[PDB]
Amino acid sequence: GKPLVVTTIGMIADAVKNIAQGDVHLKGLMGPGVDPHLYTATAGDVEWLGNADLILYNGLHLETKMGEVFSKLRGSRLVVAVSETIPVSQRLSLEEAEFDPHVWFDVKLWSYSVKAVYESLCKLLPGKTREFTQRYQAYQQQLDKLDAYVRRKAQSLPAERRVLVTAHDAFGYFSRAYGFEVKGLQGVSTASEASAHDMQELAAFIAQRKLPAIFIESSIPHKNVEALRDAVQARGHVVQIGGELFSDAMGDAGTSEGTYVGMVTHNIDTIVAALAR
């Protein structure tokens, strides 16, 4: 029977689906509304993993709480942190201590991680190199159009309006790639809430710059941004939750949002939409 590939964040699973297609049995460990940061492999999870022939994960310390489980299952099977194949050079850092793991927001730099997925699948199923290659190229072409679109789209938004404030610091590369003044109620990690002082500042910041909209996120308790929204309100500005954005998690399987391409299309759409005019 076909080999078991097991991935964490849906983004990888998407790359797998497009490349391996039905040539593998795929299990997306982290689904919609799932925060990889504070995610733990449940009983079933660590088991699916236990039988996986190929394990795929971000790297760049995204899935913070999986190191033990991985470093452990590594060596016994194929374990690959797809994104750590990004020339460190291109990975944004945080206080030089951290490495922004949200690289799937720079479509052009995500081609690396997708490349990793593709090449892992080939390593897993050598005989499937031809079909995993051509499909791959295709899927990349989709990425390319996607990166293009997100830039075009971003361009549709006057530089000043490109100030995006979201649930957590998960769009650094998005900012660096398509030019957006980004800010997040939570840091690059949700393993630390936002200090009252922090929300306060952000609230006024949004009220000072008068942001037409701030955004929620599928993987982080909305209760936090809506609170910022009120703090902004209590500051003389009614900011709209310009839409729910996909940070670390994708939409539901079977939906256009449930794919990298669509997930990101939803993002830029929702954002610029909620930010222009």
XYZ file of C-alpha atoms in Angstrom, residues 24 85 90 105 124 130 155 223 249 259 263 273 275:
13
model
C 0.466 8.647 -0.613
C 16.166 24.680 3.953
C 16.699 34.957 4.086
C 3.916 34.205 3.843
C 10.127 8.559 -0.021
C 8.502 11.943 -12.720
C 0.308 47.376 -4.648
C -11.356 37.542 22.269
C -3.562 27.498 9.997
C -5.237 25.361 0.482
C -5.597 30.624 2.245
C -10.259 44.986 0.888
C -7.933 48.535 4.123
